[PDB]
Curated annotation (Swiss-Prot), chain A:
The gene is RPS20. The chain holds residues 18 to 117 of 119 of the full protein. It comes from Oryctolagus cuniculus. The keyword NADP does not apply. Polyubiquitinated by ZNF598 via 'Lys-63'-linked ubiquitin chains when a ribosome has stalled, initiating the ribosome quality control (RQC) pathway to degrade the potentially detrimental aberrant nascent polypeptide. Deubiquitinated by OTUD3 and USP21, antagonizing ZNF598 activity. Component of the small ribosomal subunit. The ribosome is a large ribonucleoprotein complex responsible for the synthesis of proteins in the cell. This is Small ribosomal subunit protein uS10.
UniProtKB/Swiss-Prot annotation, chain C:
Monoubiquitinated at Lys-25 and Lys-31 by RNF25 in response to ribosome collisions (ribosome stalling): ubiquitination promotes subsequent activation of RNF14, leading to EEF1A1 ubiquitination and degradation and rescue of stalled ribosomes. Deubiquitination at Lys-31 by USP16 is required for maturation of the 40S ribosomal complex. There is a cross-link at residues 25, 31 (Glycyl lysine isopeptide (Lys-Gly) (interchain with G-Cter in ubiquitin)). It comes from Oryctolagus cuniculus (Rabbit). Part of the 40S ribosomal subunit. Part of the small subunit (SSU) processome, composed of more than 70 proteins and the RNA chaperone small nucleolar RNA (snoRNA) U3. The chain holds residues 83 to 150 of 156 of the full protein. This is Small ribosomal subunit protein eS31.
Swiss-Prot record, chain D:
The modification Phosphoserine is found at residue 8. Signal peptide: none annotated. Keywords: Acetylation, Cytoplasm, Endoplasmic reticulum, Metal-binding, Methylation, Phosphoprotein, Ribonucleoprotein, Ribosomal protein, Zinc. This is Small ribosomal subunit protein uS14.
UniProtKB/Swiss-Prot annotation, chain E:
The chain holds residues 1 to 131 of 243 of the full protein. The gene is RPS3. This is Small ribosomal subunit protein uS3. It comes from Oryctolagus cuniculus. Endonuclease activity is inhibited by MgCl2 on apurinic/apyrimidinic DNA but not on UV-irradiated DNA. The modification N6-acetyllysine is found at residue 62. It is a peripheral membrane protein.
Length: 100, 96, 68, 55, 131
RNA sequence: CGGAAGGGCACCACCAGGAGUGGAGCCUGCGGCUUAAUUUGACUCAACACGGGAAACCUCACCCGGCCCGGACACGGACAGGAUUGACAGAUUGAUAGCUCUUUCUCGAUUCCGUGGGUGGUGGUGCAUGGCCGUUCUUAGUUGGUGGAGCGAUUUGUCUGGUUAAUUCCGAUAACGAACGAGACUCUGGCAUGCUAACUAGUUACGCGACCCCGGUCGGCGUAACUUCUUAGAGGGACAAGUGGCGUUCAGCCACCCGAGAUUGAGCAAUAACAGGUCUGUGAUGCCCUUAGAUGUCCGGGGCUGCACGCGCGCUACACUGACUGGCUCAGCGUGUGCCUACCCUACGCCGGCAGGCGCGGGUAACCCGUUGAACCCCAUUCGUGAUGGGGAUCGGGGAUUGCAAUUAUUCCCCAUGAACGAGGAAUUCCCAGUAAGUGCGGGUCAUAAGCUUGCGUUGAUUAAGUCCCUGCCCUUUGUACACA
């Protein structure tokens, strides 16, 4: 019953709508929900030179890429939450349903 | 290129079995990733397919570090009369 | 463009007309006479003859050389 | 042996060992997060990988 | 997946995946009015959508080039059979797509139209489309 | 455009100061001078710790040699009565390259040879190009539409002046209304005892357990409440809004209450241009060159460091506001097991003074390294104005690790050696608040690896709220016989 749905996404409002959708689906299917626990955002940071040559003033580019991680833990037999999580998928987020 | 015909026919067989083929540009790669049943050096796949291309039998498209080789009608007819096969059968691209 | 050494010309091989018929002795019967011993080598058995050099014997492709 | 000598030299490390996955040259390589893309090629394709100038 | 790599390396892996896919498809579908790519990795589907202007040229004669392109996709990137599904579709109001309009100008210059006439012909179409 | 006048702005300008650089030693990039070679791009700001360029081989172009074809393709003699590939000794070399002189076996029309045509190229031209970049300039500048004025090119709007970080505004006003750049915008920092949530985060209470004399301590053990502390989502909040002055009474400026803030910091960035940089980022690329004895490429050796010399960026010092030896005590950004790809972050238990070795483990990571016991600083000693226990260059000896390989010492450790340097000439740089500076910790390069650079926190000021004197750039007026100016 104790099953772990984690959502890893680069875009935030996408992830938030998926987090909302799984709470909606859970409270409708009448099963105990642990709310969307927000793990710290990881900021992948790469900083390079701008110029292809080396005949300019030393200006650097600061490239960032945030990656967000939510998880909701439910008390439900595999099936009903599997069919809840088989609907309403968008390209931004990525799903993991963990049983044990 | 100086080639073993055994390895060359095995390349031509796979090329037919699936019309289009991919090959990384790495001439110092000991065995070919796909045809590991055969002892195919990457140099020989490239040299065979670029020799195919020069006469206008294969379609050469190059990305970052990968050759892409689609089969033409000239290649279809040469390849089928060469391997000495039934004229009916075709690559894995045609069958709906 | 000018170079240092007068070059090395690449090894041109001594091509010969029929080095094969010197592998057998002909009889006036319908029989045979095999000149150079047949090594029962892993891959290179019957049709592969051994080498008859002035110091040692040698099997071609498996490289199975023999001191006299 | 010619084939004992052609690729005889060992390459386990140094910048002769690692290669740009786009243009295949051996200067200013990005190896962070397993990119393996030279800094000019990175900067060209950076927005497609997901990297964004924010700060 | 027992290889079990970091979410950090996983997302830069997905980043370069789309980047090369796009490079390959822009090199291939260059002349046939190519707009861009999109990926939807569903449960055990890689639904890989293509956006073009002249989709009849790119999907070809009874789906020759589509199965050719699906083959090189599965062959190069190392995918499972059945799981990878390409879908070429027409982009709406091409007038606003900078990729399509830039490649249209490029192939009018490749034909050999006058340079001021090529640019003003393109720029007039962009504006009447509603830029 | 001026060798004419006037007005503006800026810590890449000055004033007031702070740290300094210049002096010394070493690290390092240029020129020079040697060398078979010491490949080279760049030369005021806008070249010189820059090419992410910390190269032992590779890298890698440079040079001394030796294999190599990876010369597709169409055509022509040649041809299995064999075109051809491979080859073990032996001298040959550096080589266990069949490169070879000299052996005889192997292979089977994919060779090899001329004719074209192709190829590859860190080869040439950045004064033939694209792209990206830098700079003028991050200064405040640029342009229509209707209307006005001129026969017209043109002009007004875009201005005498005040004000602002700002062509920012309100004022005067034949102009009114607008667009780009400024601003707004996105990220970021500070605030919520209000909200949604938490066994990958805690707390409070509790039961238990250990120790000191009912309490006290616990990062000792364990499960009911809750979200103060941690995490990250939604809204809120700040606007020169309140008051007192100054001002054409405007725009706005100065002070003061209340308040978590009364200007946090970046990202982006106009019209127009430069013969600025890159062809050594590209399978962006015109033309040229070369194309088998290669400017292709692999292999093994060295060089890129060479040292009477002159520059530029940095590091360590010149000591007592200190060095040494103990003890006490506090961080924040990250990163971590690989595609070809081999190499990850490390706790813990023994061995060795030390660098290290061996053992079992955790970790694909708010889960394990980890409560990241960092340094400066702090407390207590020894030292005592002595080129001294300051300083640690140079040199000798031994030992570990990385690697296929360290001599022209890769790095690190142990003992010994103890150079100048006593605050630095002309000249010159960066900078106004959690800033300068001191201090250490991560990311890049990385088999080995930071005196560099790119980020992070800790300790934390003196001076200034101004100006056109200096150096720059920008405008208005004026003059012209200049207009490739």
């Amino acid at each position: 019953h104790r099953i772990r749905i984690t959502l890893t996404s680069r875009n935030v409002k996408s992830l938030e709508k998926v987090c909302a959708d799984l709470i909606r689906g859970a409270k409708e299917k009448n099963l105990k929900v642990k709310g969307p626990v927000r793990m710290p955002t990881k900021t992948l940071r790469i900083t390079t030179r701008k110029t292809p040559c080396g005949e300019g003033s030393k200006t650097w580019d600061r490239f960032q890429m945030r990656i967000h991680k939510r998880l909701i833990d439910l008390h439900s037999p595999s099936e009903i939450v599997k069919q809840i999580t088989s609907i309403s998928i968008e390209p931004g987020v990525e799903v993991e349903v963990t049983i044990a | 290129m100086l080639m073993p015909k055994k390895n060359r026919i095995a390349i031509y067989e796979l090329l037919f079995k699936e019309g289009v083929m991919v090959a990384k540009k790495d001439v110092h790669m000991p065995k070919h990733p796909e045809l590991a049943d055969k002892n195919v050096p990457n140099l020989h796949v490239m040299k065979a397919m670029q020799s195919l291309k020069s006469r206008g039998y294969v379609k050469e498209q190059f990305a970052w570090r990968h050759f892409y080789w689609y089969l033409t009608n000239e290649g279809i007819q040469y390849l089928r009369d060469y391997l000495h096969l039934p004229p009916e059968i075709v690559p894995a691209t045609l069958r709906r | 463009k000018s170079y240092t050494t007068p070059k090395k010309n690449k090894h041109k091989r001594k091509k010969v007309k029929l080095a094969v018929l010197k592998y057998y002795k002909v009889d006036e019967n319908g029989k045979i006479s095999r000149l150079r011993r047949e090594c029962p080598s892993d891959e290179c058995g019957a049709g592969v003859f051994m080498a008859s050099h002035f110091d040692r014997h040698y099997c071609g492709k498996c490289c199975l050389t023999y001191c006299f | 042996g010619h084939q004992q000598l052609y690729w005889s030299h060992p390459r386990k490390f140094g910048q002769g060992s690692r290669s740009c996955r786009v243009c295949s040259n051996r200067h200013g390589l990005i190896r962070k997060y397993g990119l393996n893309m030279c800094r000019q090629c990175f900067r060209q394709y950076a927005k497609d990988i997901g990297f964004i100038k924010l700060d | 997946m027992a290889v079990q790599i970091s979410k950090k390396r996983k997302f830069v892996a997905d980043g370069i995946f789309k980047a090369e896919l796009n490079e390959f498809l822009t090199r291939e579908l260059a002349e046939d009015g190519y707009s861009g790519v999109e990926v939807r990795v569903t449960p055990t589907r890689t639904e890989i959508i293509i956006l073009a202007t002249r989709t009849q040229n790119v999907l070809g004669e009874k789906g020759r080039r589509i199965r050719e392109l699906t083959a090189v996709v599965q062959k190069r990137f190392g995918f499972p059979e059945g799981s990878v599904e390409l879908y070429a579709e027409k982009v709406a109001t091409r007038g606003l797509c900078a990729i399509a309009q830039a490649e249209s100008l490029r192939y009018k210059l490749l034909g050999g139209l006058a340079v001021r006439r090529a640019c003003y012909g393109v720029l007039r179409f962009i504006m009447e489309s509603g830029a």
